[PDB]
């Protein structure tokens, strides 16, 4: 019964919230809940010339799109967590809940 | 005769074979992460994709 709740966010304020609020509230229900596992950043680097044409000087952009991944370890059947999750949903994090 | 001689290029490789999703221009396609975007349009509309110059 290892539920593996994948938490991938573009933003930090929501990645902190969604991971914490599914533990902070899941302390009161007394189930053996673990802390959020970390994964390293992926900085999707697309470095484009600022100029549409090839004239002027060569001022390059450095477009940095960092993406992060967390998951939380559990000893729980599916329905127990589902009661907590869909209440208070925010746009940032992609919550992909694994059963196995 | 015309119809078979209308799409007779092998359209599976070359910058002419592929095309832009915004503008249908055959130069400066971002083929990293399959953005497949004319670099001039990427620059303008990367703000609402998520690409932001934080550094």
């Amino acid at each position: 019964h290892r539920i593996r709740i994948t938490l991938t966010s573009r933003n930090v304020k929501s990645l902190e919230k969604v991971c914490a609020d599914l533990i902070r509230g899941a302390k009161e229900k007394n189930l053996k809940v673990k802390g959020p596992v970390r994964m390293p950043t992926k900085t999707l680097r697309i470095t484009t010339r600022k100029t549409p044409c090839g004239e002027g000087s060569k001022t390059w952009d450095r477009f940095q799109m960092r993406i992060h991944k967390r998951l939380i370890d559990l000893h729980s059947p599916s329905e127990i967590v589902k009661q907590i999750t869909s209440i208070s949903i925010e746009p940032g994090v992609e919550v992909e809940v694994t059963i196995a | 005769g015309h119809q078979q001689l209308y799409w007779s290029h092998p359209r599976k490789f070359g910058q002419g074979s592929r095309s832009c999703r915004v503008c249908s221009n055959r130069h400066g396609l971002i083929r990293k992460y399959g953005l497949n975007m004319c670099r001039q349009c990427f620059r303008q509309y990367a703000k609402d994709i998520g690409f932001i110059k934080l550094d």
Binding site: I67 | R21, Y45, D48, I49, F51
Partner: peptide, 19 residues
């Protein structure tokens, strides 16, 4: 998903879809 689009591709596909 059967094609199984990547998580680098996800936020790009999330990005362009919005934009």
């Amino acid at each position: 998903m059967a094609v199984q689009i990547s998580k680098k591709r996800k936020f790009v596909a999330d990005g362009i879809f919005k934009a």
